[PDB]
């Protein structure tokens, strides 16, 4: 039919892409250790798509476009909502790192306490590194960056709302109790904005699978592997 | 019924955890070792030697440094029952033989 052809074509395209990606990885690990046949041009690991899929897409695209022709910027106001290649929450990360370091220095000199400047400079440095790695959102560093940023802002919110700030101690015991102040609110807005944008990367890191996930798996070697790991190598597989 | 079907297909690991792993292999052995070491006076025959025999008889395998049972026994039993005294023993009997008193 016309409905099974699409299924076949999507299967084929996905498989071609997976094989080209596995090739890029294995060729990189073989060329970074010498054994490559010397006709290998190391700029091929930059062709992302696949040669076959690319030729198909180019042909289809030119056919489509040939058969259809049988602040403020008043020429485009929606300049921010355009893909530039970096994470959306990128200038917020750097802005918050600058604000953190500035407040740390200011308050810790104007009082004499050594905690606020250490916290502020550590937070600023880690958020600056994160906002640097977030400048290429397609790659793997572009994902580990958002991870690090979320972790740091979450730790800030935690320390504020659960232990409070050393320089905010008073004589009473109900007034020197930890509440949520401005910097915690900003850090929370940051974590929420990170989660609502894209944090879906590196999704193959989780706890390993149980013998409860491989009970109805259609493969015997995988299930035997999982049982062996979790301590059940002797149980009989009457399966 | 449809909701229970969709929810059962996405939570096999958590289900097996809570039904087979949570108590029998995580909480019960911790509790048993801590309980035994809370009782059982501070000797070595009671704090280390008999625990090993009974653990191998029960679990059916000896606790080696590759297992968490060995390390739990070591820390709790040895370090907090016999070490604060065998330390004084060695500091008063074996260290004088060597150079520093």
């Amino acid at each position: 039919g016309d409905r099974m052809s699409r299924r076949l074509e999507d299967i084929n395209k996905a498989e071609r892409q997976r094989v080209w990606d596995a090739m890029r990885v294995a060729a990189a690990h073989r060329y970074a250790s010498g054994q490559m046949p010397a006709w290998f041009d190391p700029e091929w690991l930059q062709q992302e798509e696949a040669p076959l899929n690319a030729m198909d897409r180019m042909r289809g695209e030119q056919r489509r476009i040939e058969e259809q022709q049988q602040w403020w910027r008043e020429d485009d106001p929606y300049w921010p909502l355009r893909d530039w290649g970096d994470h959306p929450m990128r200038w917020w990360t750097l802005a918050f790192a600058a604000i953190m370091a500035a407040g740390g220095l200011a308050t810790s000199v104007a009082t004499g306490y050594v905690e606020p400047v250490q916290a502020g400079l550590g937070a600023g440095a880690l958020l600056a590194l994160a906002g640097a790695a977030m400048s290429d959102a397609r790659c793997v560093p572009g994902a580990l960056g958002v991870k690090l940023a979320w972790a740091v802002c979450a730790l800030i919110v935690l320390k504020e709302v659960s232990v409070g700030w050393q320089h905010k101690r008073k004589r009473r015991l109900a007034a020197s109790a930890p509440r949520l102040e401005l910097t915690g609110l900003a850090a929370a807005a940051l974590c929420a904005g990170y989660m609502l944008t894209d944090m879906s990367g590196m999704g193959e890191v989780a706890l390993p699978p149980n013998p409860g996930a491989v009970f109805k798996s259609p493969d015997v070697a995988y299930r035997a592997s999982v049982w062996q790991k979790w301590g059940y190598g002797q149980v009989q597989m009457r399966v | 019924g449809e909701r229970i079907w969709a929810w059962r297909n996405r939570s096999e690991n958590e289900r097996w955890f809570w039904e087979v792993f949570a108590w029998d292999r995580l909480i019960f052995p911790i509790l048993v070792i801590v309980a035994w070491e809370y009782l059982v006076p501070n000797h070595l025959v009671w704090a280390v030697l008999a625990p090993l025999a009974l653990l191998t008889w029960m679990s059916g395998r000896l606790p080696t440094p590759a297992t968490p049972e060995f390390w739990m026994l070591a820390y709790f039993g040895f370090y907090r029952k016999v070490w604060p005294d065998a330390a004084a023993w060695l500091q008063g009997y074996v260290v004088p033989l060597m150079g520093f008193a």
């Binding site: 062996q228 | 019960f28 052995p29 048993v32 309980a35 029960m58 395998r61 968490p68």
Partner: peptide, 24 residues
């Protein structure tokens, strides 16, 4: 090649339970 996890302690007997109330 196993994991770092406990074993069952009650596939053989029950006596270990006698330890929880007493300590309690």
């Amino acid at each position: 090649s196993l994991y770092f996890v406990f074993t069952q302690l009650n596939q053989k007997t029950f006596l270990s339970y006698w330890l929880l109330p007493v300590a309690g």
